[PDB]
């Protein structure tokens, strides 16, 4: 099986953030599976692989753009299809960065939930 | 290759931006 941790970054400050500011760390470990696919889950997924999406603040409803970092995307092993559905795959026993996507974002002080789906892949 | 449907999991976390 897979052992998954999604770890929020400490010390994030409201206001103008750096481009690609790190906001969470995804940790996936396994003794049995060599790879995994991952997709973001929200009310507005914005690309064909589900690796960028938008999330809403609990107290304000304001949206921010989030996703895998450019560096993390370049570490993908492949993009595979599960009954026609794209999933980008990555090595198990590794970590990936979730970031604020695109150009610098001005983020309103709030709590923003992030949800990911992870599935084992045997290449 | 193949996906392992029994291994699929959803994981969530709260990201906090403070004033």
């Amino acid at each position: 099986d897979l052992t998954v941790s999604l770890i929020p970054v400490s010390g994030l400050k409201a206001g103008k953030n750096a481009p690609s500011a790190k906001i969470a760390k995804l940790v996936v470990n396994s003794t049995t599976l060599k790879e995994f696919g991952v997709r973001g889950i929200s009310n507005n997924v914005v690309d064909s692989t589900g690796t960028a999406w938008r999330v809403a603040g609990k107290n304000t409803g304001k949206e921010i753009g989030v996703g895998l970092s450019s560096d993390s995307l370049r570490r993908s092993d492949s993009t595979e299809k599960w009954n026609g559905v794209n999933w980008m795959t990555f090595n198990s026993n590794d970590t990936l960065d979730i970031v604020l996507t695109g150009p610098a974002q001005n983020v309103t002080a709030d709590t923003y939930p992030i949800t990911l789906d992870v599935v084992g892949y045997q290449p | 290759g193949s996906f392992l449907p029994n291994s699929e999991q959803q994981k969530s976390a709260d990201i906090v931006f403070s004033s």
Side-chain angles (χ1 to χ4, degrees):
Chain A
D1 62 312
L2 297 171
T3 301
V4 186
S5 311
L6 183 54
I7 307 163
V9 169
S10 66
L12 299 171
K13 290 282 281 291
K16 193 179 181 70
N17 274 251
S20 289
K22 287 171 186 161
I23 67 178
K25 184 84 83 184
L26 175 68
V27 183
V28 181
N29 295 117
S30 181
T31 56
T32 49
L33 303 168
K34 291 281 180 290
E35 294 178 20
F36 69 91
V38 57
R39 274 181 162 268
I41 305 299
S42 81
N43 304 320
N44 190 176
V45 175
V46 303
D47 67 21
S48 65
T49 48
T51 47
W53 62 102
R54 298 184 69 73
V55 302
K58 291 185 183 182
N59 303 307
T60 69
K62 292 209 179 288
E63 277 188 335
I64 59 169
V66 307
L68 297 183
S69 72
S70 290
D71 291 344
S72 294
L73 293 165
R74 286 188 284 265
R75 288 165 58 189
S76 179
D77 288 327
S78 60
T79 301
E80 306 289 341
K81 285 188 183 180
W82 189 9
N83 299 313
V85 179
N86 295 317
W87 291 76
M88 298 192 55
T89 66
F90 299 87
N91 290 338
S92 62
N93 302 316
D94 212 332
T95 65
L96 301 174
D97 296 313
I98 309 311
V99 297
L100 292 174
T101 53
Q105 290 184 57
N106 199 315
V107 182
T108 296
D110 208 342
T111 300
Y112 298 88
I114 295 175
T115 297
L116 306 173
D117 272 350
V118 176
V119 58
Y121 183 72
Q122 193 84 317
Chain B
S2 55
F3 290 84
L4 286 316
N6 300 315
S7 73
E8 184 171 13
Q9 311 187 15
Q10 189 182 262
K11 207 87 188 159
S12 297
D14 283 346
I15 309 308
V16 184
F17 290 78
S18 297
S19 298

mmCIF file of all heavy atoms in Angstrom, chain A residues 84-122:
data_model
loop_
_atom_site.group_PDB
_atom_site.id
_atom_site.type_symbol
_atom_site.label_atom_id
_atom_site.label_comp_id
_atom_site.label_asym_id
_atom_site.label_seq_id
_atom_site.Cartn_x
_atom_site.Cartn_y
_atom_site.Cartn_z
ATOM 1 N N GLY A 84 -8.571 5.925 -19.747
ATOM 2 C CA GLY A 84 -8.689 7.186 -20.470
ATOM 3 C C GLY A 84 -8.381 8.445 -19.671
ATOM 4 O O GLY A 84 -8.236 9.508 -20.264
ATOM 5 N N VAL A 85 -8.274 8.332 -18.341
ATOM 6 C CA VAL A 85 -8.051 9.505 -17.486
ATOM 7 C C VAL A 85 -6.554 9.703 -17.243
ATOM 8 O O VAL A 85 -5.885 8.784 -16.782
ATOM 9 C CB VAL A 85 -8.800 9.367 -16.134
ATOM 10 C CG1 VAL A 85 -8.533 10.582 -15.226
ATOM 11 C CG2 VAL A 85 -10.285 9.245 -16.388
ATOM 12 N N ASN A 86 -6.043 10.901 -17.536
ATOM 13 C CA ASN A 86 -4.623 11.220 -17.331
ATOM 14 C C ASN A 86 -4.263 11.263 -15.853
ATOM 15 O O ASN A 86 -4.939 11.918 -15.072
ATOM 16 C CB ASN A 86 -4.274 12.612 -17.877
ATOM 17 C CG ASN A 86 -4.421 12.718 -19.370
ATOM 18 O OD1 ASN A 86 -4.026 11.812 -20.112
ATOM 19 N ND2 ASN A 86 -4.974 13.854 -19.831
ATOM 20 N N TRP A 87 -3.185 10.576 -15.480
ATOM 21 C CA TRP A 87 -2.573 10.756 -14.168
ATOM 22 C C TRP A 87 -1.074 10.850 -14.393
ATOM 23 O O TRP A 87 -0.461 9.926 -14.962
ATOM 24 C CB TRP A 87 -2.826 9.536 -13.266
ATOM 25 C CG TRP A 87 -4.258 9.321 -12.806
ATOM 26 C CD1 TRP A 87 -5.306 8.823 -13.540
ATOM 27 C CD2 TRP A 87 -4.763 9.578 -11.498
ATOM 28 N NE1 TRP A 87 -6.452 8.757 -12.752
ATOM 29 C CE2 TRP A 87 -6.141 9.219 -11.495
ATOM 30 C CE3 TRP A 87 -4.187 10.075 -10.317
ATOM 31 C CZ2 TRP A 87 -6.943 9.332 -10.347
ATOM 32 C CZ3 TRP A 87 -4.991 10.203 -9.174
ATOM 33 C CH2 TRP A 87 -6.352 9.833 -9.205
ATOM 34 N N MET A 88 -0.482 11.951 -13.945
ATOM 35 C CA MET A 88 0.967 12.062 -13.919
ATOM 36 C C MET A 88 1.521 11.193 -12.782
ATOM 37 O O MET A 88 0.984 11.181 -11.683
ATOM 38 C CB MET A 88 1.375 13.528 -13.771
ATOM 39 C CG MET A 88 0.902 14.390 -14.947
ATOM 40 S SD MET A 88 1.605 16.055 -15.046
ATOM 41 C CE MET A 88 3.367 15.716 -15.028
ATOM 42 N N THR A 89 2.587 10.448 -13.072
ATOM 43 C CA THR A 89 3.148 9.503 -12.100
ATOM 44 C C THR A 89 4.512 9.955 -11.611
ATOM 45 O O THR A 89 5.220 10.685 -12.311
ATOM 46 C CB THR A 89 3.274 8.081 -12.671
ATOM 47 O OG1 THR A 89 4.229 8.080 -13.729
ATOM 48 C CG2 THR A 89 1.917 7.573 -13.183
ATOM 49 N N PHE A 90 4.856 9.523 -10.399
ATOM 50 C CA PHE A 90 6.070 9.950 -9.703
ATOM 51 C C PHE A 90 6.622 8.775 -8.909
ATOM 52 O O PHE A 90 5.898 7.833 -8.610
ATOM 53 C CB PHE A 90 5.744 11.106 -8.744
ATOM 54 C CG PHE A 90 5.198 12.332 -9.434
ATOM 55 C CD1 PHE A 90 3.831 12.459 -9.692
ATOM 56 C CD2 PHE A 90 6.046 13.362 -9.813
ATOM 57 C CE1 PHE A 90 3.321 13.590 -10.345
ATOM 58 C CE2 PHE A 90 5.540 14.497 -10.467
ATOM 59 C CZ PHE A 90 4.189 14.602 -10.734
ATOM 60 N N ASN A 91 7.907 8.818 -8.567
ATOM 61 C CA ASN A 91 8.490 7.762 -7.743
ATOM 62 C C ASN A 91 7.901 7.797 -6.353
ATOM 63 O O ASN A 91 7.786 8.863 -5.754
ATOM 64 C CB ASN A 91 10.010 7.950 -7.612
ATOM 65 C CG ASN A 91 10.763 7.676 -8.903
ATOM 66 O OD1 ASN A 91 10.277 6.984 -9.797
ATOM 67 N ND2 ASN A 91 11.993 8.186 -8.984
ATOM 68 N N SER A 92 7.532 6.633 -5.835
ATOM 69 C CA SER A 92 7.196 6.499 -4.421
ATOM 70 C C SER A 92 8.468 6.707 -3.610
ATOM 71 O O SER A 92 9.580 6.717 -4.172
ATOM 72 C CB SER A 92 6.615 5.116 -4.137
ATOM 73 O OG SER A 92 7.566 4.109 -4.429
ATOM 74 N N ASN A 93 8.304 6.863 -2.300
ATOM 75 C CA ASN A 93 9.418 7.147 -1.390
ATOM 76 C C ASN A 93 10.124 8.427 -1.807
ATOM 77 O O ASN A 93 11.343 8.475 -1.979
ATOM 78 C CB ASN A 93 10.350 5.948 -1.279
ATOM 79 C CG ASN A 93 9.623 4.704 -0.796
ATOM 80 O OD1 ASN A 93 8.813 4.764 0.143
ATOM 81 N ND2 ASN A 93 9.885 3.583 -1.437
ATOM 82 N N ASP A 94 9.316 9.464 -1.969
ATOM 83 C CA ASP A 94 9.781 10.755 -2.419
ATOM 84 C C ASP A 94 8.784 11.805 -1.940
ATOM 85 O O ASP A 94 7.740 11.460 -1.357
ATOM 86 C CB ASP A 94 9.878 10.750 -3.948
ATOM 87 C CG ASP A 94 10.994 11.633 -4.466
ATOM 88 O OD1 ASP A 94 11.359 12.634 -3.793
ATOM 89 O OD2 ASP A 94 11.514 11.322 -5.566
ATOM 90 N N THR A 95 9.113 13.080 -2.156
ATOM 91 C CA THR A 95 8.252 14.190 -1.752
ATOM 92 C C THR A 95 8.012 15.102 -2.948
ATOM 93 O O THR A 95 8.841 15.159 -3.857
ATOM 94 C CB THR A 95 8.864 15.030 -0.611
ATOM 95 O OG1 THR A 95 10.055 15.680 -1.081
ATOM 96 C CG2 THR A 95 9.213 14.164 0.615
ATOM 97 N N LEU A 96 6.874 15.788 -2.955
ATOM 98 C CA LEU A 96 6.563 16.775 -3.983
ATOM 99 C C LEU A 96 6.109 18.074 -3.314
ATOM 100 O O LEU A 96 5.605 18.048 -2.186
ATOM 101 C CB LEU A 96 5.463 16.254 -4.913
ATOM 102 C CG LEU A 96 5.677 14.957 -5.699
ATOM 103 C CD1 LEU A 96 4.386 14.597 -6.433
ATOM 104 C CD2 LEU A 96 6.875 15.071 -6.665
ATOM 105 N N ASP A 97 6.286 19.201 -4.006
ATOM 106 C CA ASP A 97 5.878 20.508 -3.477
ATOM 107 C C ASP A 97 4.594 20.982 -4.136
ATOM 108 O O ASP A 97 4.469 20.930 -5.366
ATOM 109 C CB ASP A 97 6.973 21.570 -3.692
ATOM 110 C CG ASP A 97 8.249 21.256 -2.928
ATOM 111 O OD1 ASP A 97 8.163 20.919 -1.724
ATOM 112 O OD2 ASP A 97 9.344 21.347 -3.529
ATOM 113 N N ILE A 98 3.654 21.416 -3.299
ATOM 114 C CA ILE A 98 2.453 22.133 -3.725
ATOM 115 C C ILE A 98 2.743 23.616 -3.520
ATOM 116 O O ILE A 98 3.249 24.025 -2.455
ATOM 117 C CB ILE A 98 1.199 21.745 -2.878
ATOM 118 C CG1 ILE A 98 0.991 20.223 -2.793
ATOM 119 C CG2 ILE A 98 -0.059 22.505 -3.373
ATOM 120 C CD1 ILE A 98 1.056 19.490 -4.105
ATOM 121 N N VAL A 99 2.447 24.417 -4.540
ATOM 122 C CA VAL A 99 2.815 25.828 -4.554
ATOM 123 C C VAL A 99 1.628 26.707 -4.966
ATOM 124 O O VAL A 99 0.612 26.205 -5.449
ATOM 125 C CB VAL A 99 4.012 26.089 -5.525
ATOM 126 C CG1 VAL A 99 5.268 25.338 -5.066
ATOM 127 C CG2 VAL A 99 3.641 25.724 -6.972
ATOM 128 N N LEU A 100 1.764 28.016 -4.754
ATOM 129 C CA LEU A 100 0.886 28.989 -5.382
ATOM 130 C C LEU A 100 1.324 29.079 -6.836
ATOM 131 O O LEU A 100 2.474 29.415 -7.113
ATOM 132 C CB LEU A 100 1.036 30.352 -4.701
ATOM 133 C CG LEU A 100 0.536 30.512 -3.262
ATOM 134 C CD1 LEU A 100 0.899 31.892 -2.714
ATOM 135 C CD2 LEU A 100 -0.976 30.303 -3.207
ATOM 136 N N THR A 101 0.421 28.783 -7.766
ATOM 137 C CA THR A 101 0.785 28.713 -9.182
ATOM 138 C C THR A 101 0.866 30.073 -9.853
ATOM 139 O O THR A 101 0.364 31.075 -9.335
ATOM 140 C CB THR A 101 -0.231 27.859 -9.969
ATOM 141 O OG1 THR A 101 -1.554 28.352 -9.708
ATOM 142 C CG2 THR A 101 -0.124 26.405 -9.534
ATOM 143 N N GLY A 102 1.498 30.090 -11.021
ATOM 144 C CA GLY A 102 1.493 31.271 -11.894
ATOM 145 C C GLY A 102 2.274 32.438 -11.314
ATOM 146 O O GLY A 102 3.145 32.246 -10.463
ATOM 147 N N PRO A 103 1.976 33.665 -11.786
ATOM 148 C CA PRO A 103 2.627 34.858 -11.262
ATOM 149 C C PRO A 103 2.267 35.090 -9.795
ATOM 150 O O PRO A 103 1.350 34.438 -9.269
ATOM 151 C CB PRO A 103 2.057 35.994 -12.124
ATOM 152 C CG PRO A 103 1.377 35.352 -13.260
ATOM 153 C CD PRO A 103 0.999 33.975 -12.843
ATOM 154 N N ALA A 104 2.990 36.003 -9.149
ATOM 155 C CA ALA A 104 2.761 36.358 -7.754
ATOM 156 C C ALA A 104 1.276 36.592 -7.463
ATOM 157 O O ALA A 104 0.579 37.279 -8.220
ATOM 158 C CB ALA A 104 3.565 37.583 -7.390
ATOM 159 N N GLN A 105 0.807 36.007 -6.364
ATOM 160 C CA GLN A 105 -0.571 36.136 -5.930
ATOM 161 C C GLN A 105 -0.656 36.960 -4.662
ATOM 162 O O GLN A 105 0.198 36.844 -3.774
ATOM 163 C CB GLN A 105 -1.181 34.753 -5.674
ATOM 164 C CG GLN A 105 -1.420 33.937 -6.952
ATOM 165 C CD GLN A 105 -2.117 32.607 -6.679
ATOM 166 O OE1 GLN A 105 -3.216 32.567 -6.101
ATOM 167 N NE2 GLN A 105 -1.478 31.513 -7.084
ATOM 168 N N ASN A 106 -1.683 37.796 -4.584
ATOM 169 C CA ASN A 106 -1.980 38.512 -3.353
ATOM 170 C C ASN A 106 -3.037 37.749 -2.579
ATOM 171 O O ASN A 106 -4.220 37.732 -2.947
ATOM 172 C CB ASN A 106 -2.439 39.946 -3.616
ATOM 173 C CG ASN A 106 -2.296 40.830 -2.387
ATOM 174 O OD1 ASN A 106 -2.652 40.437 -1.276
ATOM 175 N ND2 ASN A 106 -1.751 42.021 -2.577
ATOM 176 N N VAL A 107 -2.595 37.130 -1.494
ATOM 177 C CA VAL A 107 -3.415 36.178 -0.753
ATOM 178 C C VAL A 107 -4.019 36.818 0.491
ATOM 179 O O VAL A 107 -3.301 37.356 1.341
ATOM 180 C CB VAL A 107 -2.585 34.936 -0.361
ATOM 181 C CG1 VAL A 107 -3.452 33.922 0.369
ATOM 182 C CG2 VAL A 107 -1.943 34.298 -1.611
ATOM 183 N N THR A 108 -5.348 36.775 0.582
ATOM 184 C CA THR A 108 -6.081 37.260 1.755
ATOM 185 C C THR A 108 -5.896 36.281 2.923
ATOM 186 O O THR A 108 -5.950 35.065 2.722
ATOM 187 C CB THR A 108 -7.581 37.391 1.409
ATOM 188 O OG1 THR A 108 -7.736 38.380 0.388
ATOM 189 C CG2 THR A 108 -8.402 37.785 2.622
ATOM 190 N N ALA A 109 -5.675 36.813 4.129
ATOM 191 C CA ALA A 109 -5.526 35.977 5.321
ATOM 192 C C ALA A 109 -6.756 35.099 5.497
ATOM 193 O O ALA A 109 -7.882 35.600 5.584
ATOM 194 C CB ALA A 109 -5.291 36.827 6.576
ATOM 195 N N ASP A 110 -6.525 33.791 5.537
ATOM 196 C CA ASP A 110 -7.601 32.788 5.586
ATOM 197 C C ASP A 110 -6.987 31.387 5.703
ATOM 198 O O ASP A 110 -5.761 31.230 5.640
ATOM 199 C CB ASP A 110 -8.464 32.874 4.314
ATOM 200 C CG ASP A 110 -9.907 32.428 4.532
ATOM 201 O OD1 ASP A 110 -10.200 31.729 5.533
ATOM 202 O OD2 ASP A 110 -10.757 32.770 3.668
ATOM 203 N N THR A 111 -7.848 30.391 5.904
ATOM 204 C CA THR A 111 -7.477 28.983 5.870
ATOM 205 C C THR A 111 -8.028 28.421 4.560
ATOM 206 O O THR A 111 -9.212 28.589 4.249
ATOM 207 C CB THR A 111 -8.071 28.223 7.069
ATOM 208 O OG1 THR A 111 -7.566 28.797 8.279
ATOM 209 C CG2 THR A 111 -7.702 26.742 7.025
ATOM 210 N N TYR A 112 -7.154 27.787 3.791
ATOM 211 C CA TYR A 112 -7.499 27.236 2.483
ATOM 212 C C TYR A 112 -7.304 25.733 2.517
ATOM 213 O O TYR A 112 -6.170 25.270 2.670
ATOM 214 C CB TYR A 112 -6.594 27.848 1.394
ATOM 215 C CG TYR A 112 -6.728 29.345 1.253
ATOM 216 C CD1 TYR A 112 -5.956 30.207 2.031
ATOM 217 C CD2 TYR A 112 -7.614 29.905 0.331
ATOM 218 C CE1 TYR A 112 -6.072 31.595 1.910
ATOM 219 C CE2 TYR A 112 -7.745 31.295 0.199
ATOM 220 C CZ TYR A 112 -6.970 32.134 0.995
ATOM 221 O OH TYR A 112 -7.089 33.504 0.872
ATOM 222 N N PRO A 113 -8.401 24.956 2.403
ATOM 223 C CA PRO A 113 -8.244 23.503 2.405
ATOM 224 C C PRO A 113 -7.723 23.025 1.059
ATOM 225 O O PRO A 113 -8.094 23.585 0.019
ATOM 226 C CB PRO A 113 -9.675 22.991 2.633
ATOM 227 C CG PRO A 113 -10.547 24.055 2.042
ATOM 228 C CD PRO A 113 -9.819 25.362 2.312
ATOM 229 N N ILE A 114 -6.825 22.048 1.085
ATOM 230 C CA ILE A 114 -6.355 21.382 -0.133
ATOM 231 C C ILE A 114 -6.635 19.885 -0.012
ATOM 232 O O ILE A 114 -6.448 19.302 1.067
ATOM 233 C CB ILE A 114 -4.855 21.671 -0.394
ATOM 234 C CG1 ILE A 114 -4.663 23.167 -0.673
ATOM 235 C CG2 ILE A 114 -4.303 20.816 -1.555
ATOM 236 C CD1 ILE A 114 -3.229 23.604 -0.830
ATOM 237 N N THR A 115 -7.086 19.275 -1.107
ATOM 238 C CA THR A 115 -7.370 17.847 -1.153
ATOM 239 C C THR A 115 -6.673 17.274 -2.382
ATOM 240 O O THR A 115 -6.710 17.872 -3.459
ATOM 241 C CB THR A 115 -8.879 17.565 -1.249
ATOM 242 O OG1 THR A 115 -9.542 18.063 -0.081
ATOM 243 C CG2 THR A 115 -9.143 16.066 -1.337
ATOM 244 N N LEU A 116 -6.021 16.133 -2.192
ATOM 245 C CA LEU A 116 -5.380 15.412 -3.274
ATOM 246 C C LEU A 116 -5.849 13.976 -3.264
ATOM 247 O O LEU A 116 -6.218 13.435 -2.215
ATOM 248 C CB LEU A 116 -3.857 15.383 -3.084
ATOM 249 C CG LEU A 116 -3.049 16.643 -2.881
ATOM 250 C CD1 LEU A 116 -1.644 16.267 -2.564
ATOM 251 C CD2 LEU A 116 -3.081 17.437 -4.138
ATOM 252 N N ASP A 117 -5.886 13.368 -4.450
ATOM 253 C CA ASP A 117 -6.064 11.926 -4.604
ATOM 254 C C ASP A 117 -4.725 11.347 -5.036
ATOM 255 O O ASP A 117 -4.031 11.929 -5.885
ATOM 256 C CB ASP A 117 -7.108 11.606 -5.679
ATOM 257 C CG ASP A 117 -8.531 11.559 -5.141
ATOM 258 O OD1 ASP A 117 -8.726 11.579 -3.908
ATOM 259 O OD2 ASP A 117 -9.463 11.478 -5.969
ATOM 260 N N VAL A 118 -4.363 10.212 -4.447
ATOM 261 C CA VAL A 118 -3.101 9.522 -4.773
ATOM 262 C C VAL A 118 -3.452 8.058 -5.041
ATOM 263 O O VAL A 118 -4.295 7.491 -4.341
ATOM 264 C CB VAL A 118 -2.079 9.654 -3.587
ATOM 265 C CG1 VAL A 118 -0.802 8.867 -3.847
ATOM 266 C CG2 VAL A 118 -1.737 11.128 -3.329
ATOM 267 N N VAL A 119 -2.849 7.459 -6.067
ATOM 268 C CA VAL A 119 -3.099 6.050 -6.377
ATOM 269 C C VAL A 119 -1.790 5.358 -6.766
ATOM 270 O O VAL A 119 -0.931 5.965 -7.417
ATOM 271 C CB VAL A 119 -4.180 5.874 -7.487
ATOM 272 C CG1 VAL A 119 -3.783 6.592 -8.773
ATOM 273 C CG2 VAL A 119 -4.460 4.389 -7.763
ATOM 274 N N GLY A 120 -1.631 4.101 -6.351
ATOM 275 C CA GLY A 120 -0.450 3.320 -6.734
ATOM 276 C C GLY A 120 -0.390 2.986 -8.209
ATOM 277 O O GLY A 120 -1.416 2.720 -8.844
ATOM 278 N N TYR A 121 0.823 3.006 -8.757
ATOM 279 C CA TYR A 121 1.055 2.654 -10.159
ATOM 280 C C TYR A 121 2.246 1.708 -10.281
ATOM 281 O O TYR A 121 3.308 1.979 -9.727
ATOM 282 C CB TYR A 121 1.313 3.914 -11.007
ATOM 283 C CG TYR A 121 1.488 3.607 -12.487
ATOM 284 C CD1 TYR A 121 0.405 3.218 -13.267
ATOM 285 C CD2 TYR A 121 2.740 3.694 -13.102
ATOM 286 C CE1 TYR A 121 0.555 2.933 -14.631
ATOM 287 C CE2 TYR A 121 2.903 3.400 -14.474
ATOM 288 C CZ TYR A 121 1.804 3.015 -15.221
ATOM 289 O OH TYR A 121 1.931 2.714 -16.571
ATOM 290 N N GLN A 122 2.055 0.605 -11.000
ATOM 291 C CA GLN A 122 3.149 -0.324 -11.289
ATOM 292 C C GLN A 122 3.521 -0.173 -12.767
ATOM 293 O O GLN A 122 2.718 -0.512 -13.641
ATOM 294 C CB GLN A 122 2.735 -1.760 -10.966
ATOM 295 C CG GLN A 122 3.888 -2.766 -10.926
ATOM 296 C CD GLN A 122 4.613 -2.806 -9.586
ATOM 297 O OE1 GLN A 122 4.891 -1.771 -8.977
ATOM 298 N NE2 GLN A 122 4.933 -4.011 -9.129
#
